[PDB]
Design a binder for this molecule. Structure first.
Ligand SMILES: Nc1ncnc2c1ncn2[C@@H]1O[C@H](COP(=O)(O)OP(=O)(O)O)[C@@H](O)[C@H]1O
Ligand SMILES: Nc1ncnc2c1ncn2[C@@H]1O[C@H](COP(=O)(O)OP(=O)(O)O)[C@@H](O)[C@H]1O
Ligand SMILES: Nc1ncnc2c1ncn2[C@@H]1O[C@H](COP(=O)(O)OP(=O)(O)O)[C@@H](O)[C@H]1O
Ligand SMILES: [Zn+2]
Ligand SMILES: [Zn+2]
Lengths: 341, 125, 528, 408
C-alpha cells in the first residue's frame, strides 16, 4: 500500500495537499520509493467496510485505487523549436534577462538564480565518489530589495519547488517525520519538505531568523543531498537531491558596509561554506538609479493591473510578456525542463 | 484642479450662500424621508424571517432585533441593531391587525403574529 | 396487503408537482441544463418555493422537512421522467435537492430541540474539516439460501439489512450478501465550525458544532471562511452522555443517548461594479449614492472614525485608508503584489491609543483583538494540532488566519517577544502563512491588515533624543508599515482645556457608524 | 392578560402567612404533587376567569397547553453539607455562583414507531423513564410480530442542560435544568436556587424548580442619624480602624475606594497604592480591609503569577467549548482585591494589570484559544520604596520601583 500525494508545484492556492491510497498487487511492489514521481493506472474501487458505519455517523466507506500498471517523452515539434532557440548568438544574456522580468536590476542575482535553475552535472565519478550537481544561492541584503519575491519566481518556474519560512519550520518537519501505520501498527517514516523537493529546489525564506536547531537540520541536506535519520528504531537515508535558495537579513536589519560579511550576519562560516554564490545587496541611494527603479516599478504595476476569446487573451498576455522579456515564459519553462533532462 | 480660475461673480455670492443655507434643511428632511422609505422597504424583506420559523411566544424584542442583524441582512447591505429595532417597532404600526405587543415591565415581548397575508399591505407607503 | 399512506404527503407531492409545472418554466430549463451538462443535483430558491399558496406549501415543507423530502423527491423524479428520461440512464436514479436563500439565519447559540426536523439556515466560522468520503445512499442485497435480489434498500442513518426474503418460498433472514455494483453511493463530508466573534459577548466562550455535507456541495467549505449552511437539524447517537447526573431513560436493556448535528444541503461563503449594484434596490442605491456623490465625503469620513476619541486626526485618516486596502495585483510572471496596508502607532501612556484598536475591532466586519504579551507565535499564524478521526495532523486558525480579508489588531506591540514578532512578517508582506511542520507542507492565505499599538522604549517620550533612539523596533519591521504615527502630549493650555472638557463630558454624557460599513462594502470593489 | 406559560409564585408569601408556613412544613417532602395539582389549578382558574366570569374569550391555546408554577422565595434550609440521606428529594433552597454550562442535550419525550412491513405508525410516550417497544402491529390485517421500528428523527425531545455552580451553604454542585430553564443560567451568574436535592442509585445534584438571578426602617433611621451629624467624615475615619492612629487622608481614601464611583455605559473602580516607609501600618490595613469589605480575595504580588491572577483556560471534550479555572483577579469580579508586594510582581504578571485597569478586560490569544474575560474589580496595593527606606534626596518618581506607564 502506497500513498500518492499531489505534486508540490500543483497544490491549489490555500488548500492542504490531497492524497489517495494506492494498492500495488501482483509483483507491482517496490516500483517506487519515497520522493519519486510516478504515474499509475488502476481501478477506482471502495473497500472500507466495517465499523465506519457506526463509529462515524451514518453508513460511509472510503475509496482506494488498486494499481494495474505504473510508470516513473518529448515530441519532435518541441525539440525543433528548442533547437531553433539554441542557435541564437549570445543566448545566455536572453536567459538571464528572462528571470523575473518585473524585478528591475539585480543582474548579478538573476544570473545566480538562472544558474541554480539550470544546475550542473552530478558527477558520480567512478561511482565510489560523488559531487553535488546543484548551485546553492544566498540572498543577503537590506529590506526593500526583493530578496523574497525572487523565491516567488523560483517556486513558479522550477518543475518542483518547496517553500518554507524560517520560524514556521521545524527540524522534524523539514527532514522527516515518524508515523505509525494505521493497518500494521508498525513504525513508518514520512518524508519532509527536503524529501518532497527531491530532484527539485527547496526555498527557505528569512533563513537568519530561524532557530539554531532547524538551521542545523539543513547541514546534511546542503551537501549530501540526503536525509539521514535514526528514530524509533528506523535507520534509513532518503534522497534529498535539491538546491537551496535562502534569503536573510543582516544583523541589526541594515548592512554595515564598513564591516566584513563575517560580522554582518548571525550565521557562521560552516553554513556559509555550503553555499556557492553569495549575493550582497545594499539599498544605497542615488538619483539616477532610484529614478530608473521607480520608473520600472510603476510600469510593472501598470502592466500587472487587470485590464476564441481564450486565444485572444493568450495573445495579449504573450504580448505583455514580450514587452518585458525576450523569451516566452512557457517556452522558458519547457526549455529548462528539457535542459535538465 | 485650478478649475475655479475666474468665477467673477458679483455680490451675488451672498445670495449663493443664501441658496446654500435656506434649502439645506429641505435636503436634510428629504434624507430623513429616504431613511424612512429605506426602513419601509426593508421591512418587506424581513417579515419572512418572522413568518418562517417562529410560532411560539418566548421571544422578547431584544432577541428578534438581534436576529434581524447577524442574519440574511448580514450581506451586501448590512443593517444596524437600532435600525432593526426601528423595523420591528414599525411592523406593529404598519400591521395593527396582527401585532399588539405591549410594554411588560422593561422592553417588549413579541408574540406569534396572526399573518393574514405577507406583503399586500405595503401599498400604504 | 396495502400499506399505510400519508394523505398529507400525497397532497404535498401534488402541490409540489403543480408548482414545478406552473412556476415561471425556469426550473424545467434547469433540468434541461442538468441533462446537457450531466448534473446530479437540482437547486431551488426558497423564496420561489414560498410564493405559491401564500407560502403555506413552503411552510409545511420546511417545518417537517425530514418527513416530506421523499414526496418532493418522488415528484421531481416523476417530472424528470416526464421530460428528461435520459437522466435515469447509467453507463440508477440518484437525484438530490438543495434549497437556498433562506430568510432567517440562526446562530449556534439559538440551537434548540424544537428545531429538530425543520428547515433552517446557520452561519459559522470553519475551524476543522475532514476529507470527503463516499456514503451508502441506497443498497441492494442478494439472498443466501436462494438467489433472489432485493433492490432499493434505503440505509436510513444506519447499516440496515433486509428484514425478509421477498419470495415466500424462501425463509432467509438475518443473513444477506451486499451488492457493490448495483448499489449506489454519494459523497460525504463533515464540517466543524465555530461561533462567530460578533455573537459571543465579552466573557463568554464560543460554541462549537459539527455540520454534515453530502453530494456535490462538499469541499466548498474552507478553514477560516465565514460559511453559510442551509438544511435541517438531526440528532445522532452519542457515547459521552455516560456519567452525567440525573435519571436516564432506558429501553426494554438498551441505551437511547443522543447528540445534535446539523445536515446542510446548500453551501455558500460570504464575501465587479454592476454585479454588486444589481443586488440593491433603488432606495438602497440612493442611500449608498449619497455617501459617494458628495464633494467633501473624504473629510466627512475622516471625522467619523471613532468619534469618542478627540483629536488625533492623522490616525483617523490612517485607519480609514487601511479599511479600504489597495487592489491586489498578480504579475504576468505570476508574482503577486500585496494590497493590504499595515499601520503602527506609538504614543505616551496617556494618549488614547487603545481606543482606536477597540473601535476597529468593534466596527470591522471581520476583526480580532489581542494583547502583545498574551499572544504567542502559534496563536497568531496557525496551530499544528493532532486531528480527530485519525492519527495525522491538521492546522487550526490563529489570530491571523481568523479575520482573513479583515483587520487584525494587536495592542502593546513593543512588548511582544521578537521571536514571535518575526512570524508576523510573512503575513505582513507576502499575505501568506507557510507551514513545514509535522506532515503539513501547505501555504495558507493570510490576507490581513495589521494594526498595532506600542509605547516608547522608556514609556515616556524622551523628547531630548530623536525618533531613532526612542524606538526599540528594528528596521525590518518598521519598513513594513505603510503608515507610521508617533503622537505626543504637551502642556498647551488651549489643547488641555478642550481635552478635559470632552473627557469629562464622556463621563457625564455627519455619517453614522452603521453607514460606514455600507459605504466600504461598495468602495472596496474599485480597482483604480 | 399575559401569554406566559408559567407563574413565578412569590414564595416569601408562604412564610408571611401561617397556613402557608404549615403548607411548607407539610410540603418539604412532596413538592411534585403540589406542583402537579397547581398546574391543573392554574388551568381551571384561567378557564373560570375567562369564560365563567365572562371577562375574556381567548381560551383555546391555554385550554390545550400545559402550565407550570415556580416558587422563587422559599425559606432556606440548614445547608448543603448538613442535608441527611432522608433530606434527599426534599424541597431545598441554596445560593452560590455559576461557573460552567453544558450544551443543549435533548431528552426523550415521544417515541415514533413505524411498522417495517406495512408502514403503520404508532405514538409511544415515556412514563417514568421507560420505553415500551410494541410487540406486534396493531392493524387487523398486519399481525407481524416485532415489525415495529423507531424512526430517530421523527421523535420529540426536550432540552436538558447541566450547569456548574459553586455553592455556599447558609463546595461546587452540578445542577440540572430542563425546558426553558436551559441557557437561562450562564457563566458567572449570581444565583440563588430553589429546587430539589437529589442523589439517586448517588451523585449530589439539584433539580432546579426556580432560579434567582440576583433590613428595617430603624436601620434607615440609624443611617440617617449617622449621615446628618456634622462629624460624619471624622467619625467614619475614627471608627474604620482603631488599631491605626490618625492618618485622616489615608482613611478617607480607602473608605472612598470602598464606596466606589458611579458605573455608566466607564467604571468607578478606584485603585490606591501605599508608598510609605516599610514600617508603617499598611499590612494591618489591607488585612483588615480583606475582612471588613464584602468578601473578596487577598493576594500578594510576589506569591502570584499571570495564570494565578487571570485564569487557566482550556477546551473540553464533553462540553465542546472553552472552560475557565478562575483566578483571583477574575474571582474578585465586582468586589475588592488586595495585592501586597506590588513592587515584587513579575513583569509578565504586571502586563496583565494594564488592560485590567484600562478596560476591565483580559484578552488571550494562544494555541486553539482566542477569548476575552472580564475582571471588573478594585485593587488596593502596597509597595515598599526602592531600597530600605524612602529617600527624599531622590525624585519621587525614582523612589518607586514601578515604571511610568503603570505608576501614572
Ligand atoms: N529591484 C527591484 N525592482 C523592482 N521592485 C522591487 C525591487 N526590490 C524590491 N521591489 C519591490 O519591493 C517588494 C519587496 O518585497 P520583499 O521581497 O519582501 O523585500 P525583501 O525580501 O527584500 O525585504 C516587492 O513587492 C517588489 O515589488
Ligand atoms: N483624545 C481623547 N479623548 C478621549 N479620551 C482620551 C483621549 N486621550 C486619552 N483619553 C483617555 O485616556 C486613557 C488612555 O489609555 P491608553 O493610553 O489607551 O492606555 P494604554 O497605553 O495602556 O493603551 C483612555 O482610557 C481614554 O479614556
Ligand atoms: N501605626 C501603627 N499602628 C499599629 N501597629 C503598627 C503601627 N506602625 C507599625 N505597627 C506595627 O509594626 C509591625 C510592622 O507592620 P507593617 O509595617 O505594616 O509591615 P512590615 O512588617 O512588612 O513593614 C506590625 O506588626 C504593626 O503591628
Ligand atoms: Zn431467499
Ligand atoms: Zn404492520
Amino acid at each position: 500500500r502506497v500513498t500518492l500525494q499531489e505534486a508540490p508545484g500543483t497544490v491549489p492556492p490555500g488548500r492542504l495537499p490531497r492524497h489517495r491510497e494506492v494498492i500495488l498487487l501482483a509483483d507491482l511492489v517496490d516500483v517506487s520509493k519515497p520522493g519519486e514521481e510516478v504515474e499509475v493506472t488502476g481501478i477506482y474501487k471502495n473497500n472500507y467496510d466495517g465499523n465506519l458505519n457506526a463509529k462515524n455517523g451514518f453508513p460511509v466507506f472510503a475509496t482506494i485505487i488498486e494499481a494495474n500498471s505504473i510508470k516513473r517523452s518529448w515530441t519532435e515539434e518541441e525539440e525543433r523549436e528548442f533547437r531553433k532557440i539554441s542557435r541564437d548568438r549570445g543566448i545566455i544574456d536572453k536567459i538571464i534577462s528572462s528571470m523575473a522580468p518585473s524585478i528591475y536590476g539585480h543582474r548579478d542575482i538573476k544570473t545566480a538564480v538562472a544558474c541554480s535553475l539550470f544546475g550542473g552535472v552530478p558527477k558520480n565519478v567512478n561511482g565510489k565518489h560523488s559531487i553535488r550537481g546543484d548551485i546553492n544561492v544566498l540572498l543577503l541584503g537590506d529590506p526593500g530589495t526583493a530578496k523574497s519575491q525572487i523565491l516567488k519566481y523560483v517556486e513558479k518556474t522550477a518543475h518542483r519547488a518547496v517553500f518554507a519560512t524560517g520560524q514556521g519550520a521545524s527540524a522534524v518537519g523539514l527532514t522527516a517525520s515518524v508515523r505509525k501505520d494505521p493497518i500494521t501498527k508498525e513504525w513508518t517514516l514520512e518524508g519532509g519538505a527536503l524529501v518532497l523537493a527531491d530532484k527539485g529546489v527547496c526555498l527557505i525564506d528569512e533563513f537568519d531568523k530561524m532557530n539554531d536547531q532547524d538551521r542545523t537540520s539543513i547541514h546534511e541536506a546542503m551537501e549530501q543531498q540526503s536525509i539521514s535519520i535514526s528514530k524509533a528504531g528506523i535507520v534509513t537515508t532518503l534522497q534529498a537531491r535539491c538546491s537551496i535558495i535562502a534569503a536573510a537579513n543582516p544583523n541589526g536589519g541594515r548592512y554595515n558596509s564598513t564591516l566584513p560579511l563575517a560580522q554582518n550576519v548571525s550565521l557562521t562560516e560552516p553554513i556559509l561554506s555550503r553555499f556557492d554564490i553569495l549575493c550582497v545587496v545594499r539599498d544605497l541611494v542615488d538619483e539616477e538609479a532610484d529614478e530608473r527603479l521607480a520608473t520600472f516599478v510603476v510600469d510593472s504595476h501598470v502592466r500587472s493591473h487587470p485590464e476564441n476569446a481564450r486565444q485572444r487573451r493568450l495573445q495579449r498576455q504573450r504580448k505583455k510578456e514580450e514587452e518585458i522579456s525576450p523569451i516566452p515564459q512557457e517556452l522558458l519553462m519547457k526549455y529548462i525542463h528539457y535542459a535538465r533532462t | 484642479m485650478y478649475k475655479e480660475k475666474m468665477p467673477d461673480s458679483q455680490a451675488n455670492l451672498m445670495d449663493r450662500l443664501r441658496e446654500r443655507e435656506r434649502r439645506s434643511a429641505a435636503l436634510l428632511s428629504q434624507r430623513q424621508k429616504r431613511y424612512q422609505q429605506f426602513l419601509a422597504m426593508k421591512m418587506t424583506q424581513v417579515f419572512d424571517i418572522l413568518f418562517s420559523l417562529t410560532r411560539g411566544q418566548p421571544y422578547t424584542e431584544t432577541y428578534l432585533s438581534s436576529l434581524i442583524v447577524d442574519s440574511l441582512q448580514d450581506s451586501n447591505n448590512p443593517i444596524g441593531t437600532k435600525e432593526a429595532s426601528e423595523i420591528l417597532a414599525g411592523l406593529q404600526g404598519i400591521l395593527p391587525m396582527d401585532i399588539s405587543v405591549h410594554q411588560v415591565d422593561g422592553g417588549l415581548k413579541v408574540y406569534r403574529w396572526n399573518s393574514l397575508d405577507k406583503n399586500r399591505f405595503s401599498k400604504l407607503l | 396487503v396495502k400499506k399505510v399512506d400519508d394523505v398529507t404527503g400525497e397532497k404535498v407531492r401534488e402541490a409540489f408537482e403543480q408548482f414545478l409545472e406552473d412556476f415561471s418554466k425556469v426550473y424545467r430549463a434547469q433540468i434541461e441544463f442538468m441533462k446537457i451538462y450531466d448534473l446530479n443535483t437540482i437547486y431551488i430558491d426558497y423564496q420561489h418555493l414560498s410564493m405559491r399558496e401564500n407560502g403555506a406549501l413552503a411552510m409545511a415543507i420546511s417545518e417537517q422537512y425530514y418527513r416530506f423530502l421523499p414526496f418532493l423527491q418522488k415528484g421531481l423524479r416523476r417530472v424528470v421522467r416526464k421530460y428528461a428520461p435520459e437522466l435515469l440512464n447509467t453507463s440508477e436514479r440518484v437525484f438530490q435537492i438543495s434549497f437556498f436563500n433562506l430568510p432567517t439565519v440562526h446562530r449556534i447559540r439559538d440551537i434548540r430541540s424544537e428545531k429538530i426536523g425543520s428547515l433552517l439556515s446557520i452561519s459559522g466560522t470553519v475551524t476543522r474539516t475532514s476529507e470527503v468520503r463516499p456514503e451508502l445512499y441506497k443498497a441492494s442485497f442478494t439472498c443466501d439460501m436462494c438467489r433472489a435480489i432485493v433492490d432499493n434498500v434505503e440505509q436510513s442513518f444506519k447499516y440496515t439489512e433486509p428484514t425478509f426474503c421477498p419470495n415466500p418460498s424462501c425463509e432467509n433472514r438475518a443473513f444477506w450478501t451486499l451488492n457493490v455494483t448495483r448499489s449506489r453511493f454519494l459523497d460525504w463530508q463533515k464540517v466543524r465550525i465555530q461561533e462567530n466573534a460578533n455573537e459571543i459577548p465579552t466573557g463568554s466562550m464560543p460554541r462549537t458544532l459539527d455540520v454534515i455535507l453530502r453530494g456535490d456541495s462538499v469541499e466548498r467549505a474552507k478553514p477560516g471562511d465565514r460559511c453559510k449552511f442551509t438544511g435541517v437539524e438531526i440528532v445522532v447517537p452519542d457515547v459521552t452522555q455516560l456519567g452525567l447526573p440525573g435519571v436516564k431513560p432506558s429501553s426494554t436493556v438498551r441505551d437511547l443517548t443522543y447528540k445534535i448535528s446539523f445536515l446542510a444541503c446548500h453551501v455558500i461563503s460570504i464575501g465587479d461594479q454592476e454585479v454588486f449594484l444589481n443586488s440593491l434596490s433603488s432606495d438602497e442605491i440612493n442611500e449608498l449614492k449619497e455617501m459617494v456623490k458628495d464633494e467633501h465625503i473624504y473629510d466627512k469620513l475622516v471625522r467619523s472614525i471613532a468619534p469618542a476619541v478627540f483629536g488625533h486626526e492623522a490616525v483617523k485618516k490612517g485607519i480609514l485608508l487601511q479599511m479600504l486596502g489597495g487592489v491586489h495585483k498578480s504579475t504576468v510572471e505570476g508574482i503577486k503584489l500585496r494590497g493590504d496596508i499595515n499601520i503602527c502607532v506609538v504614543g505616551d501612556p496617556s494618549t488614547s491609543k487603545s481606543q482606536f484598536l477597540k473601535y476597529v475591532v468593534g466596527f470591522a466586519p471581520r476583526s480580532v483583538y489581542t494583547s502583545g504579551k498574551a499572544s504567542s507565535a502559534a496563536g497568531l499564524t496557525a496551530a499544528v494540532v493532532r486531528d480527530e478521526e485519525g492519527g495525522d495532523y491538521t492546522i487550526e486558525a490563529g489570530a491571523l488566519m481568523l479575520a482573513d480579508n479583515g483587520i487584525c489588531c494587536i495592542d502593546e506591540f513593543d512588548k511582544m517577544d521578537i521571536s514571535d514578532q518575526v512570524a508576523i512578517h510573512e503575513a505582513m508582506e507576502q499575505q501568506t502563512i507557510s507551514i513545514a511542520k509535522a506532515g503539513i507542507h501547505a501555504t495558507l492565505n493570510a490576507r490581513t491588515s495589521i494594526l498595532a499599538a506600542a509605547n516608547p522604549v522608556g514609556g515616556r517620550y524622551n523628547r531630548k533624543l530623536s525618533l531613532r533612539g526612542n524606538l526599540n523596533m528594528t528596521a525590518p519591521i518598521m519598513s513594513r508599515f505603510d503608515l507610521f504615527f508617533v503622537i505626543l502630549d504637551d502642556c498647551n493650555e488651549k489643547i488641555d482645556t478642550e481635552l478635559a472638557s470632552h473627557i469629562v463630558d464622556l463621563h457625564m454624557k455627519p455619517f453614522s457608524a452603521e453607514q460606514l460599513r455600507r459605504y466600504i462594502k461598495y468602495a472596496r470593489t474599485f480597482k483604480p | 392578560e399575559l401569554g406566559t406559560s408559567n407563574l413565578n409564585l412569590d414564595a416569601r408569601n408562604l412564610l408571611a402567612y401561617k397556613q402557608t408556613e404549615d403548607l411548607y412544613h407539610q410540603l418539604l417532602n412532596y413538592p411534585q404533587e403540589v406542583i402537579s395539582i397547581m398546574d391543573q389549578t392554574i388551568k381551571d382558574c384561567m378557564v373560570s376567569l375567562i369564560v365563567d366570569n365572562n371577562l375574556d374569550y381567548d381560551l383555546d391555546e391555554i385550554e390545550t397547553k400545559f402550565y407550570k408554577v415556580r416558587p422563587y422565595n422559599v425559606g432556606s434550609c440548614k445547608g448543603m453539607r448538613e442535608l441527611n440521606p432522608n433530606d434527599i428529594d426534599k424541597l431545598i433552597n441554596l445560593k452560590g455562583l455559576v461557573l460552567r454550562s453544558t450544551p443543549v442535550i435533548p431528552d426523550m419525550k415521544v417515541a415514533f414507531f413505524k411498522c417495517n412491513v406495512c408502514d403503520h405508525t404508532m405514538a409511544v410516550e415515556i412514563d417514568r423513564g421507560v420505553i415500551q417497544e410494541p410487540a406486534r402491529c396493531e392493524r387487523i390485517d398486519c399481525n407481524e410480530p416485532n415489525s415495529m421500528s423507531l424512526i430517530h428523527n421523527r421523535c420529540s425531545f426536550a432540552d436538558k442542560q447541566v450547569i456548574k455552580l459553586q455553592e455556599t451553604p447558609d463546595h461546587s454542585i452540578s445542577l440540572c435544568v430542563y425546558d426553558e430553564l436551559v441557557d437561562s443560567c450562564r457563566a458567572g451568574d449570581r444565583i440563588e436556587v430553589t429546587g430539589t436535592f437529589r442523589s439517586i442509585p448517588y451523585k449530589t445534584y439539584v433539580d432546579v424548580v426556580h432560579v434567582k438571578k440576583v433590613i428595617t426602617d430603624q436601620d434607615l433611621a440609624k443611617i440617617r442619624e449617622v449621615a446628618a451629624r456634622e462629624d460624619l467624615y471624622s467619625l467614619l475615619a475614627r471608627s474604620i480602624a482603631p488599631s491605626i492612629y490618625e492618618l485622616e487622608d489615608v482613611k478617607k481614601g480607602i473608605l472612598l475606594q470602598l464606596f466606589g464611583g458611579t458605573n455608566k455605559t466607564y467604571r468607578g473602580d478606584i485603585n490606591i497604592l501605599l508608598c510609605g516607609d516599610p514600617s508603617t501600618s499598611k499590612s494591618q490595613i489591607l488585612q483588615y480591609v480583606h475582612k471588613i469589605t464584602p468578601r473578596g480575595v487577598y493576594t500578594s504580588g510576589k506569591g502570584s503569577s499571570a495564570v494565578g491572577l487571570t485564569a487557566y483556560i482550556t477546551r473540553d471534550v464533553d462540553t465542546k467549548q472553552l472552560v475557565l479555572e478562575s483566578g483571583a483577579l477574575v474571582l474578585s469580579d465586582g468586589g475588592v482585591c488586595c495585592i501586597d508586594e506590588f513592587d515584587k510582581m513579575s513583569d509578565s504578571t504586571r502586563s496583565v494589570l494594564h488592560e485590567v485597569m484600562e478596560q476591565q478586560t483580559i484578552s488571550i490569544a494562544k494555541a486553539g484559544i482566542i477569548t476575552t474575560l472580564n475582571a471588573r474589580s478594585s485593587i488596593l496595593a502596597s509597595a515598599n520604596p526602592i531600597g530600605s527606606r524612602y529617600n527624599p534626596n531622590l525624585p519621587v518618581t525614582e523612589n518607586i520601583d514601578l515604571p511610568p506607564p503603570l505608576l501614572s
